[model samples]
Target chain A: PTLVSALETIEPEVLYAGYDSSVPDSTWRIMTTLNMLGGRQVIAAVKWAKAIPGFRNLHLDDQMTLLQYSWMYLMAFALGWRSYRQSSANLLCFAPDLIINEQRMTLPDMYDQCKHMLYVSSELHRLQVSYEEYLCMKTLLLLSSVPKDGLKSQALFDAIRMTYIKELGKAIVKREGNSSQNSQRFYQLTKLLDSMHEVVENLLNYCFQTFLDKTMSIEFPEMLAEIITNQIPKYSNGNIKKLLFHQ
Target chain B: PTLVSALETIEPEVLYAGYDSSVPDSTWRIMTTLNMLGGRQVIAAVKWAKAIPGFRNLHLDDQMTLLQYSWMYLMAFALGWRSYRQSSANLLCFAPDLIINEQRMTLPDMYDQCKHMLYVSSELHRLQVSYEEYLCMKTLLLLSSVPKDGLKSQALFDAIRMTYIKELGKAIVKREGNSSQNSQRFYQLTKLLDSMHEVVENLLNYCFQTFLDKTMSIEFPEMLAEIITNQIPKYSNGNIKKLLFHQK
Candidate 1:
């Protein structure tokens, strides 16, 4: 009857980043595949964000705003989670078809980004975050940043944010089988959520730069182009408010 | 069965500001009394913020952060609501004993603040905002702003914020006995909440300046002094996030 059940049920199922593994190792192809995967993840994340309980009830502007502000984090989080489960947190699981070993991680601009993403997966393995906890934390990420001023449904936005927060707490309770370590786990999880921004910020800078460099001519799919060209920069302009778990 | 009932029950009751209207109006006395009233309101508001459902569940830091960020708006909103019911939104109902008439409102330094406060009461009157709606909006004001980064209990804060927004919508539905114009009403009320910030910002600026100007001989109570000298400036330094209802 708690919000966690709703979150678990509405959670999106497995989606492929649609990266083609047949191609030989080339920096240009790898870059193109990563961008393509980003586009696909954005599409998947939009569906997930829409299905989030009470998300569609928000003002249309708010729905779009939340999605645009968080799409990068959403994709990065999924990649980390997948990497943890699929490769023991040792490799970058961009998708089932496209796995990046440490050797593949050496490309320019991607080396540091991959390292940070791997760090998230390793931490996920280290903490052994439960699926339920993962679901709630991911949802929290969606509600995390807002316009510095506010949302059209500011009150509703806040309430929904609190609801997921409570759900995340509930998930922790379920994981520990008691409240003994709830605060400890909550701190760890929220800190993990906060850490994601730095990683995603780096990734976004790389993605946006890659999108802009006509000399490279890396491809961006339909939805990704719209969001990257329009939505990402709007919130990135320091007008966005990032929600942190610590001081 | 909803959060509004809990709010209604927990909401603080009547408080007397203890202003002696019998005394002749002097600028010094008026300023002193206003500051004293502000101090009292801060105490009352802290109690109410604590009593708010799920408020105490927050991290201690978040509880204090939210209360400090919002005390002024909470006080201003209450004054407007009280004025609307007590004086047809005409006089400033600072409290039961401190009804500020147009003449009292003319005092230096308070003139602009009183005018803005009166505008809030008038708007409250114009919309015929119901008591239930009033409670919801007031609660919303308390949860309005946060450190630009976030609270320690950011998730909890967000969930509780959403819960009340839904309650506010439910209250509107009850008042109208239907949902036909819920959007229209919700829009107006949120805009009103957004408008209170500008007014409160002005009031806070005045209060903080007054607190600093020892030459004015205005007296701030202990809690007021701590908040004015410490908490108020922390958020005012462009580090706090303001939630707005409109795009602009």
Candidate 2:
């Protein structure tokens, strides 16, 4: 018989069997039995651990140790299962230093310079420094070898350094530069500068090449010939190929 | 007779004469005669040499003198008539000194100390000075006034004067100090600057003020306020009104 016909032949109808006189019981306790049988079946599937065909028999502790060796796979499975239901909203795994650095750079105009320093205190944080101090350090590093004029005093150097750093940062991000630095913050300012440089180079190259090509076509002999040939279908065809070909 | 009956009685053939038939020999003769008659009729309309009933007559020579004096009116009339079609395109009626002086001050970047003598030429042109010696006079004037520096006694003052002239010219035009002055072709550059200033001021005041009034509530209190308010709105309506009132 077909599967559907076989299922229908012995099917116990709980509602109708309660009223039927031929059935012994109305509801069979089969769900509990099936669940217990499924549990036993799962246990039986992994019961042949010490009975390899060619290996010597092992003790339970050794088997347990072997089982412990495979615990990583089971842990991976558990993690994978939990991850499937995990919420995707809060999935950020950014480094804390990078976040703190951005906060330090962006918070200067809001808070006072000293107040900003307080937020990035050197005692609590390693990288806390005022923009003025940072600028002085940068100036000492950059202009140490240069000859000092009357205007090249420490104060003037500090001011010039600050101006340079602020202008550089402004140019990189197309925004005002902050007046604070936090040690915990991870700022890749050079990368931003490199990105800007690449962008500018590409734009300049495009413009320059376009202008040169346009200008050359107006005066250059080969370019003129190419332009003329492009205008005429007959000349553009392979008919002029032999006349121009030296090889 | 009724109007319609009278119109029907009138001849219709004579009303719509063709052009060729209208300009026939006989018609032409009669038209020429009428034209002369019309001329005489117009002439007859002029007053003759006689006193009217209510008016007195003066001496004939005196009248002739008046008529001769009236010839001056004819001359004036002719002059006025010619002026009606006269072209004002190239007329130098305005002040030449003002124009050249302004150009010298405003277009200094066009020349250096060596070319400073061009201003003398321009000045002579302004004053309509005809002497060719005026050029030499300018060179002598420069040599006498320019202070001698260590560089071969040529005088750094000349360089300073030249630089000042160039910078002054640029400032007058509100442009970069080293921008080329060849773009200035006409003599009314000062007038053009005035016009530009007026236009920019008007645009800033009326149109831009209206824009800020509608979109932004900030009222500019000073030049700086105007500059900042033009960028972004920061004040509320009450404060804006107070500020603008104070500015006014």
TM-score of each: 0.45, 0.11
Expressed as tens digits, the lDDT of each residue in B45-93 for candidate 2 is 1121111111113333222222211221122221222222221212111
**DockQ for each candidate?**
0.00, 0.00
A1-247 per-residue lDDT for model 1 (tens digits): 7677777777767766554455334333344455556665676787678788889888877777777678778878888899999998999888787787976543333456678788889989989989888888899889888777677789998888898898888778876464657888888889899998888776665434223211111223344446553333424546678888886
Question: What would the TM-score be for candidate 1 when compared with the true structure?
Answer: 0.45
Chain B TM-score of candidate number 2: 0.15
For candidate 2, what is the DockQ?
0.00
Which is the leading candidate under lDDT? 1
* Candidate 1 Cα errors over 4 Å, as ranges: A1-247, B107-109, B209-234
Clashes of each: 16, 3
Please give the fraction of native interface contacts (Cα pairs under 8 Å between A and B) kept by each candidate: 0.00, 0.00
| lDDT digits (tens) for residues B1-248 of candidate 1 | 66788888888778775545564443323444555566666777877788898898897767766776777788788889999999998898877887878654433444566788898999999999999999999999989987776777899988999999998888888765646588888999999998887888776655442222111112432354465433343245466788887856
Worst 10 residues of 1 chain A by lDDT: A209-218
Query: Model 1's lDDT to the true fold?
Result: 0.73
